[PDB]
Amino acid sequence: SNMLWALLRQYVRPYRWLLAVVAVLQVISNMASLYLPTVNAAIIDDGVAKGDTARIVELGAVMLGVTALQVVCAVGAVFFGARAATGFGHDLRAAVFTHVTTFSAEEAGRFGAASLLTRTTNDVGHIQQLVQLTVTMLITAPIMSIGGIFMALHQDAGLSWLLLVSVPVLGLANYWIIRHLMPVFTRMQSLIDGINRVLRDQLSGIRVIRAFAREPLERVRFAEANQTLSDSALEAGRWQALMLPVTTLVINVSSVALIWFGGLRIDAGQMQVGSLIAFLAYFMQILMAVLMATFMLVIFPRAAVCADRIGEVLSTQTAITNPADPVRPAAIAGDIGVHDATFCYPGADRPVLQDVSFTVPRGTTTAVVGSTGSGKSTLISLICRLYDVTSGSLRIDGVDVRDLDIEQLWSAIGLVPQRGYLFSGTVAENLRYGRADATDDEMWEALRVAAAADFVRAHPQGLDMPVAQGGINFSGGQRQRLAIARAVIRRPAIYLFDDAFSALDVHTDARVRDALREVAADATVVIVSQRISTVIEADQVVVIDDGRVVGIGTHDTLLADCPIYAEFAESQAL
Amino acid sequence: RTRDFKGSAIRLARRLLPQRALTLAVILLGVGGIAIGVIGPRILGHATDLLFNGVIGRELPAGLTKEQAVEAARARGDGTFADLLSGMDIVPGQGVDFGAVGRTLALALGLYLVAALLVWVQARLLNVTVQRTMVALRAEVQEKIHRLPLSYFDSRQRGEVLSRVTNDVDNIQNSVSMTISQLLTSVLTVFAVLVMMLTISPLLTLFTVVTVPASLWVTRWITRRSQPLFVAQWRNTGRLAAHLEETYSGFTIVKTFGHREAAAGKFAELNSETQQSSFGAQFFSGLVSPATMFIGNLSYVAVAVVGGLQVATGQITLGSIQAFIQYVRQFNQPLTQVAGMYNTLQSGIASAERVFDLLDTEEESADSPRRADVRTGRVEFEHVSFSYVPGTPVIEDLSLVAEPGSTVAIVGPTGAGKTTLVNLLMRFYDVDSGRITIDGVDIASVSRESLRASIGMVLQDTWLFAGTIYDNIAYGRPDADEDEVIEAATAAYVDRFVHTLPNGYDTRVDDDGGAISAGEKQLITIARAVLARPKLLVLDEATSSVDTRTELLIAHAMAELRRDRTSFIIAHRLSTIRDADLILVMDSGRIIERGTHEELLARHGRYWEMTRVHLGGIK
Ligand SMILES: Nc1ncnc2c1ncn2[C@@H]1O[C@H](COP(=O)(O)OP(=O)(O)O)[C@@H](O)[C@H]1O
Numbered sequence A: 001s002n003m004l005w006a007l008l009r010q011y012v013r014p015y016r017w018l019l020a021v022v023a024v025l026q027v028i029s030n031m032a033s034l035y036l037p038t039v040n041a042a043i044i045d046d047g048v049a050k051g052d053t054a055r056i057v058e059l060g061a062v063m064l065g066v067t068a069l070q071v072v073c074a075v076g077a078v079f080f081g082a083r084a085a086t087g088f089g090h091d092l093r094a095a096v097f098t099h100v101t102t103f104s105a106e107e108a109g110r111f112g113a114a115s116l117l118t119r120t121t122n123d124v125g126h127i128q129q130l131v132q133l134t135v136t137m138l139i140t141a142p143i144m145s146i147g148g149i150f151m152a153l154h155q156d157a158g159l160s161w162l163l164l165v166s167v168p169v170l171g172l173a174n175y176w177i178i179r180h181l182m183p184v185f186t187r188m189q190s191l192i193d194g195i196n197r198v199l200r201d202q203l204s205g206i207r208v209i210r211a212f213a214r215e216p217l218e219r220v221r222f223a224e225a226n227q228t229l230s231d232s233a234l235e236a237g238r239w240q241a242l243m244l245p246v247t248t249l250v251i252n253v254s255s256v257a258l259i260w261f262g263g264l265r266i267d268a269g270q271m272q273v274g275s276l277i278a279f280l281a282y283f284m285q286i287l288m289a290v291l292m293a294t295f296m297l298v299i300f301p302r303a304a305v306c307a308d309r310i311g312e313v314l315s316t317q318t319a320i321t322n323p324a325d326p327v328r329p330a331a332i333a334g335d336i337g338v339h340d341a342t343f344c345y346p347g348a349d350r351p352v353l354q355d356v357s358f359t360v361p362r363g364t365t366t367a368v369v370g371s372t373g374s375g376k377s378t379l380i381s382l383i384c385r386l387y388d389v390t391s392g393s394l395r396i397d398g399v400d401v402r403d404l405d406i407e408q409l410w411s412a413i414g415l416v417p418q419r420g421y422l423f424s425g426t427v428a429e430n431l432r433y434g435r436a437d438a439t440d441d442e443m444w445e446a447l448r449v450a451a452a453a454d455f456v457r458a459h460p461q462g463l464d465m466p467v468a469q470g471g472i473n474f475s476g477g478q479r480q481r482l483a484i485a486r487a488v489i490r491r492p493a494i495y496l497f498d499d500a501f502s503a504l505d506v507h508t509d510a511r512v513r514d515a516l517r518e519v520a521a522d523a524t525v526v527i528v529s530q531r532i533s534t535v536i537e538a539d540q541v542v543v544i545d546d547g548r549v550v551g552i553g554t555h556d557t558l559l560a561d562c563p564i565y566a567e568f569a570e571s572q573a574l
Numbered sequence B: 001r002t003r004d005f006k007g008s009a010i011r012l013a014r015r016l017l018p019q020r021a022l023t024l025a026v027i028l029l030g031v032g033g034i035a036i037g038v039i040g041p042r043i044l045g046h047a048t049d050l051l052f053n054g055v056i057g058r059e060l061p062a063g064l065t066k067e068q069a070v071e072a073a074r075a076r077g078d079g080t081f082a083d084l085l086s087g088m089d090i091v092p093g094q095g096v097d098f099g100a101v102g103r104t105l106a107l108a109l110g111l112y113l114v115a116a117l118l119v120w121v122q123a124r125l126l127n128v129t130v131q132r133t134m135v136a137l138r139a140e141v142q143e144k145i146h147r148l149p150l151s152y153f154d155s156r157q158r159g160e161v162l163s164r165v166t167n168d169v170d171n172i173q174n175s176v177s178m179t180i181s182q183l184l185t186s187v188l189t190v191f192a193v194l195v196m197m198l199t200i201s202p203l204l205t206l207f208t209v210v211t212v213p214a215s216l217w218v219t220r221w222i223t224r225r226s227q228p229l230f231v232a233q234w235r236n237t238g239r240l241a242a243h244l245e246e247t248y249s250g251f252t253i254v255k256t257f258g259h260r261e262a263a264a265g266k267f268a269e270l271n272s273e274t275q276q277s278s279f280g281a282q283f284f285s286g287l288v289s290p291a292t293m294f295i296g297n298l299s300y301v302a303v304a305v306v307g308g309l310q311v312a313t314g315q316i317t318l319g320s321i322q323a324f325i326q327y328v329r330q331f332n333q334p335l336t337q338v339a340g341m342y343n344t345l346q347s348g349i350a351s352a353e354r355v356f357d358l359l360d361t362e363e364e365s366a367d368s369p370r371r372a373d374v375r376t377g378r379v380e381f382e383h384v385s386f387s388y389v390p391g392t393p394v395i396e397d398l399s400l401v402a403e404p405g406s407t408v409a410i411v412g413p414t415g416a417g418k419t420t421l422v423n424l425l426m427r428f429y430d431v432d433s434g435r436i437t438i439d440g441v442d443i444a445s446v447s448r449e450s451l452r453a454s455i456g457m458v459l460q461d462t463w464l465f466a467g468t469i470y471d472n473i474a475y476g477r478p479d480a481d482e483d484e485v486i487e488a489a490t491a492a493y494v495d496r497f498v499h500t501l502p503n504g505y506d507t508r509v510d511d512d513g514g515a516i517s518a519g520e521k522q523l524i525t526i527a528r529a530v531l532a533r534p535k536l537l538v539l540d541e542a543t544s545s546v547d548t549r550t551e552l553l554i555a556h557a558m559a560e561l562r563r564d565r566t567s568f569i570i571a572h573r574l575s576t577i578r579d580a581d582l583i584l585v586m587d588s589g590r591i592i593e594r595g596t597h598e599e600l601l602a603r604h605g606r607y608w609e610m611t612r613v614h615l616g617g618i619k
Helices: A003-011 A013-047 A053-101 A105-111 A113-120 A122-138 A140-154 A160-204 A206-211 A215-241 A244-268 A274-314 A376-383 A406-412 A427-431 A440-449 A476-488 A506-520 A555-561 A563-572 B006-019 B021-057 B066-075 B079-085 B098-145 B150-155 B160-200 B202-209 B211-249 B251-258 B260-286 B288-312 B318-340 B342-359 B418-425 B448-455 B469-474 B482-491 B518-531 B548-560 B597-602 B606-614
Strands: A336-343 A353-356 A365-370 A391-396 A413-416 A494-498 A524-529 A540-545 A548-553 B379-384 B398-401 B409-411 B435-438 B536-540 B566-570 B583-587 B590-595
Touching (some): A003 A013, A003 A122, A013 A140, A053 A122, A053 B211, A053 B288, A105 B251, A113 A122, A113 A274, A113 B211, A122 A140, A140 A274, A160 A206, A160 A215, A160 A274, A160 B098, A274 B318, A353 A548, A365 A376, A376 A494, A376 A524, A406 A413, A413 A476, A413 B251, A476 A506, A540 A563, A548 A555, B006 B021, B006 B098, B006 B342, B098 B160, B160 B342, B202 B288, B202 B318, B211 B251, B211 B288, B251 B260, B260 B288, B288 B318, B318 B342, B418 B566, B469 B518, B482 B518, B518 B548, B590 B597, B590 B606
Parallel strands (some): A365 A524, A494 A524, B409 B566
Antiparallel strands (some): A336 A353, A336 A391, A540 A548
């Protein structure tokens, strides 16, 4: 209700001087439209009943000039209003994207990309449409009404009180209807969204919907949603149906009273006939503008909920922040230290990770393995600071990770997440993200290390073979290998592998790892794994279960001392 | 684009028809209200006639004849004036006769009240009818969706049926409700105003009707000019959406590696381009209304001047011209909306034809209420040769036998046909040649509600609706008790991670902040399958995203410990399958070999080969 205006009065500020010109152009166009009946009154007054056809044609030329001015001013108003609305949309999109860019992974997951995209483009377009409509169409009715009152005062104000009382009652009736209708419209929009959600959920898993033979429950849920939406829409239709007839009746009754009082004034000889025609045309214009403006009032609740959804994003401050007093070492080696670190979402009953105390030497391959959901997926994000430590501390080369400059840390971190993704263009373009200036020889070396050259070389385009927008056109193993190679051409101090090796063939994993230790043994490698065969070769192995460390050491010591890792190994062995 | 206009409109009108007399009454009330709303201004013009007659007759000397007054005016000149005096009912020296004006205005006011009441009642009835027919359409679409065979959802595109079933009915609502009211009232209004105008004068009527060709031509020309800019804006917004998808979906990768600023610059360039395109498109789109209003205003100039000069000749009275001007305005008012609502009308008609084509799709064969029951789980297959389409034999000469205590496993490379195997076992598709029997009962003569409610089946992917995790697990059996849900949940080890969420068992799994990755998604689905208490469990590679330890624990606890029920296991990891009762090796749509782990180890073949892929990966 109020969020939309709190957004408009902020993000239309650069276009105040342009809204001023569109307002004055609309005022002039509307004033000419209402001036046409004025000169019509003049021609019927002193042209008719006097027999002067020269005055008839002269005032006809005057009216042609007036309508030409009206069209030029209306065209200019539409042009400038379109520019203002489009610029507002551009500014809002830029601001929303910039604010989203500063988000961490936590808030990005909280909103979700599939909804963030629409919230940054289509839910900006929905407000842009309302801004343009209210600039070019909606404000016509108030402008029409004020101009009508002014022209009534100009044209024998002795009866202008009729318009001065008629317009306020029409405004009060329409405002009452709008006030009683708008919450119903908002509820109807929310219920439409809900029924669309129900239908989408039913369509997505129709196979599993029929698998459990739960058709009656789905039918009942859909019937309930449809019925409540129907009730809300029926109330909205009632209010909207008691809307046009009220305005039409008000205008017609005011016109009848106008005829009566105009006849009374003509009897006294202080009125002329043409003014009645002018007043009737004023009323017709007011009715036309009111109908054409308040017809579009369905747009406002949709834009209101839309602006609320956008303000959800715009009002969320990022948790991650640079310390503003960052430590700036010349370089950071591959020494990773975790000391009693814990991580938990707010309000969670138990932490997702707790009491981790493992450390790695200057250059070492360390693999962390654990069961699904046992906090292993968050340790990688904690090292590179996607999230932040709630209790405990994590330090890089002896200095706390929360105090280190985050951009330098990311420049020194070569990470491939479990959320495997690629960008559009060629393989060379995606691979360029590693260094942005490497020669093709370095890229080929990267594919050789990542065991991706064996298949990419067969393509005639070579490094320039096109890829899908989301990487769908490649297989999961190929996507993981490409991400691996993108990591390889960075020469980072620490390698951060987020179960990328899980989707690869075991021989391919072994060759990738041995090539990696052939080229970058000095660089520290941290691996979170779901499969033992990628963990046996690691120098140090740490196992976490239920969000807590349950073992640490070398592989054979893990068999000898850790029952949980023994179970893992006996379940993985063929 | 649309392919059928007349038929789609006819069947939509038929869908609104079945109330018969109610629709007839709606049309009648609309016609009435329009007719009285048109007649009203004529009565106002008659009142203005009386006023004008009185005011111009008070000037002439009293007691003279009207013809004598005209002659006296003409004798001094003023030929146009005398021709005017000749053009109304007047007697010199007479007053304005306020009684006649009062009764005329009372009649006009009563008619206006009646017209307003009729229009309000018509709008109310039409709204009720539209909502009723829309509830009927939604119920019909739901019944259709629950009656379609799975072949449609398989053959249809991913993003097509959702917009066909969800957005199309919304377009149906925003089409029928808007047009059948506004278009009908506007057409009736323009026709009634036209016939009234012709009753008043045809020479002015021509000047008021020349607008329609001009206005329609202007609208069509502006649409033709706008089409290139519209497609440019569409393409630019598509590029912007693609770039935003790239940035948001791969947010981690762009955030890392320091490519934030490059993405920001690319977004800035795309935003400037779409700003330019949208500016042009919206300007040319909104240009239409000023142009048609200009054409109508020019018509207003024409009618005003011609009526004035013709009244100066005395061919008609002043009140007729006042009414005529009001009719000209009431004639132009609906034209602008009618010109622009054609796109909405045709969009609604196309959506209606699409929805009715969906509703005309053939349904799967009716159920046979045999009410089958399971007692031993002896699932047997014989000579099954099912294929999705006439062509490649996706399944060929397939045959197998199960055991009551068997957790038999089907293993093979991706694309072999295990998913279609379990789908056929679900009767999702018909089987050509061969027969499927369980416990000696042919499932072809068994109702699907009796069959699928007892098997229990999980896909590789996970379907989770917009409910809490608790409802998601309880969907397997809503009649289950509150703590039975928790027991089935802790049997599937979802409780191992659910308590780490912000709201345990109450998290909106649709709204979740990404804390539920694929493995725990599969854990939740496995818990839901457990809660249903099935006796013929099958696992279509819901085995994928979970760790092997949790894998083996769950598989043991709810397939091998539960010896009373047989099970089907599908997994790409041979470890998770080892030591199971009977193993089926299948490739190229047929079973290569079958036996136990020791047996396929002893005889070297395909199974020995994939065992030589992971551990002994001799490549
Ligand atoms: N629309 C479709 N969806 C799925 N499979 C299809 C489709 N059309 C044809 N097929 C064929 O049906 C077969 C089904 O294989 P599938 O059961 O998915 O194997 P797996 O269970 O190993 O994934 C595929 O080999 C595929 O070629």
